Symmetry: D3
Subunit: 271 residues, 6 copies
């Protein structure tokens, strides 16, 4: 298993920029060509929510074209900036197992040594996340029938407060429901999230829980300052690789930088 994992693409309509100046459509198209160009090709690409910025039809048309140009199977979940019905209408052909019901979008993937669980934490009419009882019970059934086989969950909102003054009040509001599931099921070992536009990681029992950077703009972590900042600090994604018994996640830079060069011992320490 090799997965490329991006999020918070924030697509705008054709010929619009985010906030009028951040060319998200071009930046994401660059990211898509970067992923198509990888030497070690992933089995699939995950996009963990906030696919579009305003939940508008014309933004989904752009998303559908640019994400549709990935030469990979996709697993897509919504974020709070998404519109559940339009998300399903435009993006379900790219990710068929989302289903038919915009209020119950989720699926399990059983192709790999670790099972993948994709869920919808977005709630209409708010930025905060919410796990519906049907999501929690579907998750219980998945984890129970899964038995010993390890599981990872992908969702948009982090299920616990991470100390980020801007992002915490809009985390998953009833994230305790997922925490309770990691306590029940030792099989559940990874939860990956978007929303925060930041690589921030923590551990609850046997679960590693991490948020991801955005593909374009980032949000700095502040503990005591509430100003809604964003910046254009370097974009990245997470590659997830099954390495024997270990699920390993590594950061893959989406920036354009100098290098690589080859290490040479004589050049390292001249005599």
């Amino acid at each position: 298993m090799l997965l490329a994992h991006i999020s918070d693409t924030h697509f705008r309509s054709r010929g619009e920029k985010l906030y009028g100046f951040i060319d998200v459509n071009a930046a994401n198209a660059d990211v898509v060509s970067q992923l198509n160009a990888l030497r070690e090709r992933p089995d699939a690409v995950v996009v963990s929510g906030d696919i579009v910025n305003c939940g508008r039809p014309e933004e989904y048309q752009v998303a559908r074209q640019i994400l549709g140009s990935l030469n990979y199977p996709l697993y897509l979940i919504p974020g709070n900036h998404d519109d559940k019905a339009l998300f399903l209408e435009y993006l379900q052909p790219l990710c068929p197992q989302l289903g038919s019901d915009a209020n119950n979008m989720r699926c399990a993937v059983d192709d790999f040594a670790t099972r993948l669980l994709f869920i919808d934490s977005s709630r209409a009419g708010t930025s905060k996340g919410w796990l519906t009882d049907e999501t929690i019970s579907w998750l219980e059934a998945q984890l129970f029938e899964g038995g010993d086989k390890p599981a990872t969950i992908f969702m948009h909102h982090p299920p616990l407060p991470l100390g980020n003054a801007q992002m915490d009040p809009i985390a998953c509001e009833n994230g305790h429901r997922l925490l309770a599931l990691v306590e029940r099921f030792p099989s559940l070992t990874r939860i990956f999230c978007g929303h925060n536009h930041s690589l921030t990681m923590t551990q609850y029992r046997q679960a590693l829980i991490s948020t991801l950077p955005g593909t374009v703009h980032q949000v700095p972590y502040c503990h005591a300052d509430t100003d809604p900042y964003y910046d254009l600090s370097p974009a990245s994604c997470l590659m997830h690789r099954q390495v024997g018994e270990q699920w390993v996640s590594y950061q893959h830079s989406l920036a354009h930088y100098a290098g690589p060069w080859l290490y040479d011992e004589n050049i390292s320490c001249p005599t």
Copy 2:
């Protein structure tokens, strides 16, 4: 607790650049001024190893001046690029609790809600890591005598293979002995490492185990390619914060990037 955690500074001697062209001394002096300029000030800075590039006295002179200009308590550990005796001679004044024996540099910090354990995984005459008999024993003594207070270890070499073709053969050779400590001691929940010049994370039992980016040059993760690559992809560090019961780690960019601006709902979705 707030810790700034940097790694793999690779200082060179006063007039010199790494490989002749990468100005590590200037890049690290910038990092140091960035850390002194933070609005949310850390309690301490951790430098997890490969402090100098060649193990030479003149590189340690530069490291002592530049790391000495941090306005923070420091916790310093060696990497394989370091020389134990010189590391002690030059850097112990910046981290007195290392001790007096260059063969047994270790310390436990008990000031915070989580116990911090700093060890030397470097071995003279090789790039691979090794945990001495004394280290393994001292580590076990800290955990055994430490009750239910959680512990995090800082060491230079990853204690397990991560699938990185360049970096795996030179991980901690008897790292499985530390993995046996995570199995027996549920209070051991974090292991942070340098060596890899890459953010790569995994979970083993309750332990989250992560390598860090370097402050200057990075090494990309390849699964099959053993070509010794490095590049100048964006540098960053890890901030570690205690957030109630949670140890949270977030990536702090050390690059210079546009921003920040403030989010405005009307600019986000114009009508």
Copy 3:
């Protein structure tokens, strides 16, 4: 009083760039978010003319949206690239006291310790400036009733030749009319202008007279070369602050640069 003062925005229609390659709409939207993000928030924003590039309705629609997204009261005046009638139609809702008559756009602001006088130097069918007799007589009435209270004038065209070979032939053609007013009224102490895309300052009696940089492209000052150059040298604006009895103007960079860091005496002069 704190004023942020920008000019020569040169807005184009949606999806056009200036000259086909300078993204003025994105650059100005960046500037607008920068101004919204200021820690020391101005009382108002002044835009001293050449709001649009071609005087076209679709350019005013873009200007109205982007300038309308400033979280500040605005004072707007036209430049030669503007169309007086369309300027009034689209931008008067953003600056109500311009009035109702496109040929007599001007206003006085009496909110601060120094009174602010906004005038229209643009003339239909030419690049040169012109002060109509109704503007001059309105100015005489304003300065006479103002008495001892200091006054600053904002206009698009500089009222005297500044030695700039490109810009001088298209300065205010009858600028002597304003010069004559500074001679009559010792109360008149600042005249700020756009047009030149350059920070160029001079003094006539008690008046400081300055042109401003553009928000996007600049024009270099040449004394003896007549080629109509423009470049993308660094953009800035002027902040105007009342400091006791002093009106002070300082340059605020609109570029994205490294820093800030904090000054430290030990780092400044190592021993």
Copy 4:
């Protein structure tokens, strides 16, 4: 008359960078080659002070070599970072009219339509400015014996507070004594200063009074915040030109930027 006016070069010793990371010696050598490359050649270059960073002989050796490679007559004055005796020893050969007494470095230039007056506002053992009894007196003698020929003063410290929270407490402490000279002497119409690393301008009676940007690092203007910030925002200098009766100052960018291109009416507004 054409003068290029730079300020606050802050040279370091031969192998050294400012704060360990800002290459002032290289940045200043670039500035020097830019000045030698101008098509419109100045009659003289003014360096208004803080020539070196630490007042050390080896910094003056670098300053003498780099400033000595200007193909222009120089007018040099000290700042608080300078050492008077060493400034005289090393730099008087580049500006012979400074004199022979390191405690009374002053000169009047009478070659142009405006008299130029160069003074030392620096005081040993402090960052604030001070006008010695002898300086104030000599300044008054120049103005009193100078009739109706206009005068401009170059000095390092601003003679009045500008509202800059970082820089105001370290302005010229008895600067009001120079303000008394502008009140009594209408021929005194320009005062130009370093110290602030910022273009900030004000008018007092007939005098335009301005601080300059540095050639390398800048200090932002804050009204309330006293945190000692500096940044690497775009560097520039001031060109001073005599244009008939007008002394005109314009900002000349020292950055490397795209351009110039030529304005074309058809490219500006396509049909």
Copy 5:
């Protein structure tokens, strides 16, 4: 004779980017303003094929506007990405001597000391080039009546394999036909081509044969790797100048870089 020679502009429709992220329309408009701004003004501009990217009408509308804004006579030829009929419909007014027949576009220019021969190597329904027999016989007539006067050919596809693994299989397929002409006619001394997005030169008898860089994106030369790479390495064009008996070609950078400065012997070798 001075010719500016660009190629492979790859224009897209209004508001589209190449591959969704490379702003070719803006980049080419920059190039056009750079060419308009040249101090040594060319007699004509040559564009050697792949004017548009997809052969679509809306792309030709953009090409026609941007190339139409060059203040020079143009010589335009098609490449494989072009559509012969639409090329003629939109671009023939910019280059009248292309003619009236989209299948037989070619012309001779006899204005200079060397005659210029523009031909169409593009073939409908393929990327490979093809020289029709009517092109070869027209060329024979041109070279025969030309006699002793030297000749240069401009065509899109290189007439021989250059060892480029990506580009060779799509060179001119029957390029031997042109090679046979250089063997017959010692008068034929230059053949310039687009297609390769790379400055690559060779010699066959008395003919210098060269491909050109693109105005925007480039393609790296690989000998043994077949992956269809492109990059944004620096763009340039070729200036062709008649220097007495010599046709000389020099590379003119279209990038924005630091400089120029003037060489000074004292600054070069300090003493």
Copy 6:
């Protein structure tokens, strides 16, 4: 045969930058690591002259270390910036076939399908080139005794004027003597040169004759302007490859640029 061909490295002494600001030593060390990192490895690297800037021993010490870290056989020749005796003392160990006589440094390489001839066109006490009586004779001996095997010459100075106003007066003064050799010897088909810091090419009989860009700073081509300009436009080198019967030269960028990505037909022309 694959040759990497660089030129005009202009090394400075250990702590020094070219003109005080261009870090040639670092830029060349980067070039060297780029060359060692190529996937398609050259058989040899050619350095066509102006190896050091000032002809000083300490510059040769740097050149020997940096050029000595190339993992390739080297062919080195002098330029006018070089000192013959010191060039031999320091660099002959890197290119033993230069010989033992600093006045007659020449060698023929016969390893490949094309004979390579390396000569010294530099003359002590001038910037112009000169072919010694012995060189011309030895060159003729190589060609006369060499039969129908093709030959390429590497020399520092162009053997003919190229129309470059700065560089033409300092070309090879008796270069016409080498032109006489191309006339008599059809096997002589390539002459490659440094000196110009510009890719400029021409053909004389069967010989393709080209100058190279420098590895660091470039000199623009001007026809009328003699002002001694240099700039930091993109650096590159020439790769020379034997492709069957064809000697092919391609430009290899030494800049750091975005890319590469992979061409995709669907991303190229979306529907």
